[model samples]
Target: KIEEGKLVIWINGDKGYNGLAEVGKKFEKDTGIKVTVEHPDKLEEKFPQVAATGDGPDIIFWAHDRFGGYAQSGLLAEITPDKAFQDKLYPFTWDAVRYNGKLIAYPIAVEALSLIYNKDLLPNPPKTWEEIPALDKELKAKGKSALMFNLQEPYFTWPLIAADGGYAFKYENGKYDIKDVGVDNAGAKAGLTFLVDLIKNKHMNADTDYSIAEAAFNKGETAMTINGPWAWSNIDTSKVNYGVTVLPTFKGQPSKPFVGVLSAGINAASPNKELAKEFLENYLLTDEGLEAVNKDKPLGAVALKSYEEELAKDPRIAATMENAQKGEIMPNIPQMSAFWYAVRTAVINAASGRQAVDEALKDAQTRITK
Candidate 1:
């Protein structure tokens, strides 16, 4: 729009990102520029090379965490949204999109896991360790499961670990300290055992996979389950009286979940920087622009607070807002690439009783540090 040039945007190939095409069309209509949006299958893996060769799109839609190394490596241009735009976004949104203290991308949405429960079953959300066990008994007596989640998946179990002090890596300053791995320590060990005890005590089972848990909850066979925005698409609110909130704490402490931010960044080496920046600043932040991008699914947390009021009327967005306030932003470093799989394996092993909690976490530390 800055000139008569075209704006090419490489969108992430996911249903969550599918609505961007209409947003691109709106951009073209509003301006004289021609816009094209494509979702290349290998966009995430091949983007660096494409940018290096100066063949990448003017803008790329992806996770903010992925831009950490890219921005440091000079593949992304700094994005300085005006104060008007800045004041509208959540504080963490700015923090998640920064690299080396520079704003590297425009964060579109923030995501975090929250506990969804049947309001008729649990009018008051559980708060501490004692309450969880009580709810399990109450629900079971009614011929329903108290809770359901994939124990083998770290994403679901991590809040427990985190409440007990299990972090993938430590952050000394603003950056992640790769050498300061904290997953095998005392706090983590306690959290891991507590998670295993939930299984050992018959509250949940390792056999309950994500699909099975979701189906059970959907049928109202389970009273509560923990999930993120993506789960909203599969859920039918009319079928059950549902409500959402952040996971309850352990030992009366906070339960922190991983927060993911979806964002857009411009190629540092692009020839159309002016058009790219102009589109991002002027059109991308407008209400009409945001509506076009979010029309397909209203799951992702809206980045701007101005538009969130209406979205929050739906319980899903309200729960996301609650969790986002308490969640930790996902660490964005190359070292974190290996962090997820290792922790996931450890959580699975301990929950399944395949190994002692300590031994499983030790193996995770070894794998992550290797």
Candidate 2:
């Protein structure tokens, strides 16, 4: 039990503000504990400073992958699961919050990429990457662009690589091995080649920013796009009939998108750890909490048991949730940050026709490993 006072939490300024505020109000009403939520524009900047000084909020909500760095530096508290909690969570969802054999956070939501197409424009979505090229050819014959892709970031490339049987890093002996940086591997190379070929064959355009691709899709300039639930609200379904499906497979296996978990964790040094934990348990782990989350953020829920019943009535949400089951959780290793930065530069260099794929990849390997 917590001494009733004010409990504070932090969340991303842009995404979690409205939902967290509603949760805070409900928590206060349920427990008689006044809740305060802070939305800092520079959360990434302020997190370390506040953590170092032991003055951070009692609870925090952010990406699970980012917690690895904090855990490595002793900034995050471990939340080891007992048998009951362990059995309730989805395996992949649980693994996402587990770092170095320890559970470091509680997952609140999960998201994955999917192929979203204008159903009115195309009667059927492609079932394979090969079909993508053919569809592009057919669309261009009619003077329409078939697809848009984010070539600037690896965040979007991981699924294509996975479709071709590639991975960012391989796990063996309970540790991640960097020897197989699959971004530069043969399967990954083939995936990259396919993407470049799509651009060359007029099947897809390489957009430097997601906003441009989304705007083009919304305006009906593009028929299909690869993105996540975060883009659902901004999509112009008003003018076009849109449908979403899992990304097409490349070697008989479906594309494995990067599953990112949005989660909440108690601060190790907070004055209100007990109250914060109670609030988190009720707001993020209970049926009421799940309902509150779904009400504000319509993506999907992280609680595996509650998700199916909550989203059963909404077909679109049900479809998105189904696609999420096939995804691979993004790595929670601190090295992932360096890996992304290096791979992105290499991909940019290769995509621009500036260098050979091998050379670009070699440079990326050196930069990341160094």
Candidate 3:
């Protein structure tokens, strides 16, 4: 359909540097299509402008959460996945790209929140929320912080809420039910109470920033942290004995980490749509391309079967994949924008002692409802 050549793509500038460069070269070589990629720093701002004017790149790479907003605005072209292709994607990854029963994107890589601990400091990581508090107290008594997390952001807190049976929004009857938004549910309150208690009791540093948390963990100043696989490559394992595990469960249900997918999608409006799809089908989905990306990146795969053989060899990968099975895709809903900021404010306010948990969460629920 595209006459055997020419595909253009626009991706977030950061992704181009990370793994897209290699994917692009392989795509061009395999399909005999010239691939042009533009990395714009202001894509969030610029893309909407481009889409509004009906003049944008044929293919774009963005987080699945943004798909909802795009679809709601009619800025995205809907994609119908072939049954065979759809069957190949990991269910959680597929879920991230789906909204209102429509698959609007393709999955590239998958990630979820997982527990990374210093084995020397913690011989055994806490296996549940109830176990964590006692472990924290024990570690603090010995002059070490038990855990570290970004108290200032919702991303870190969301998992705890999920472990306690909270959800941002539940999908039912083919649409989101905001009335069931569970940010302030009983389980969520307990999780928040635990976090606030940790901060109050000095089991976690009140001043931990992203850089400080990574540095502290690498230096063995903290016993554990909950983060995604993206941090794998940067961590210094030589500084301490380290191990990765799934986040602890609550009442036997696993912590529901927010899973995200990085994927390649064809533009319905692209003059070269067929060619782009062809390249993705042949090159991107093949074992070689998947291996090439996973070898360097090594998060986990969206293509369920492709990474298993390789993942089995690495203990960390095994842990990540196992944990991914318990994960929930971050909701790809337009309401996510409101949910993220409001939840973040509530968490930070409670952690900083600026507000009580009940007040903060009640305010958060109201903000999301509005």
Candidate 4:
């Protein structure tokens, strides 16, 4: 009865399970209902299949994108919170979790890619595209790269693409129309060309990867690198003085990175649905729960509006939230799986010069729309 009555939840271990464990500890203490948090292996894949057994986790902690697919598959419960509570969350979070006009997930944190630069070197952050190359020359003279990032990856590459007029989905009448894939368009080619030339001109090396880029920034070998807020948890700020801000403009156009939200959801078939709902909506969204969450990783933009002013006190966190608000919300449709692999291949192949931008983008569009 003890194990059977426990409020069981499955979490993604890669996203810092220890923090959720701590939250679980307090939840049990306050709710007086035993709570168990499990980071089952391959949780993302194993979850739905296991959940279909009608005896899996009461709750699932994951990114909001999955909420739609799971809900459509009858694996997720409709999450209906009071209007007062709903109003406290970022509107985008609600939008991401809404599947078929019903809320299906509990938003935990908001994430987006931004420029993390060495404040020691850049007293004033680069604001224009022209300023980037000018600063690169200065850093290159000092035997370093000015701006380095994972250009081969689409998440980092897509902002420049969209900023240049390429878009993944056409937003129409408050809904995303997946029919509007724009990978092979003229704007995408121009954006792809600019990123390719960054390496061709030696401003950035084609081979520079995540570890190399981060090591370069940490050792003061590079002035800037594009990364998300979660990466800050591992960064040694004492040695590597840094500041996080929105990416600099691209060719007179605004940079718009993908904004993602991590959320919690309950299994539709869980016998412990009410208990799971209370835990997630009541406790997890509380200021204390959010404080514990931030303590775990100092999440850039927490989902709840309660901490806006508190988080805004830190210019970096404020910039992260501001940048997130400015960026595009990641589409929650399952078709997004096709989009990632296709777009990533487009970016990687073009960046590596293995294929021309036109051909690479054409292949990407074919792969996605296929």
Model 2 stretches with alpha carbons more than 4 Å out: 1-6, 16-19, 171-175, 178-180, 206-211, 299-301
Tens-place lDDT digits, model 3, residues 1-370:
2223576677775453345557778777766667777878887667667766666777777777776777666666666568887767666677677768777777766667789999999988888866877887788778787788766677877777667777888876446787778888887887788778877876776666677778888888889988777787778977888888878887677887777777665555567766666656666666666776556545464445565556657767677766767776777776778899999889888988899998898899888877
Ranking by lDDT: 4, 1, 3, 2
Model 4 residue runs over 4 Å out of place are 1-6, 14-31, 171-175
TM-score versus the correct structure, for each prediction? 0.90, 0.89, 0.89, 0.90
Question: Clashes in each model (backbone N, CA, C under 3 Å)?
Answer: 0, 0, 2, 0
Clash pairs for candidate 4: none
Task: State how far residue 62 of model 4 sits from its true place (Å).
Answer: 0.8
- What local distance difference test score does each model get? 0.79, 0.72, 0.73, 0.79
lDDT of 2 at 60: 77
Off by over 4 Å in 1: 1-4, 13-26, 82-84
TM-score of 3: 0.89
Give the 10-residue window scoring lowest on summed lDDT in candidate 3.
12-21
**RMSD for each model, in Å, please?**
2.8, 2.8, 2.8, 2.6
Q: Compared with the true structure, what per-residue lDDT tens digits does model 2 show for residues 248-358?
A: 887667787888888777666766766766677656677766776567656364545665566656655665656677766777776677788887887777777786667
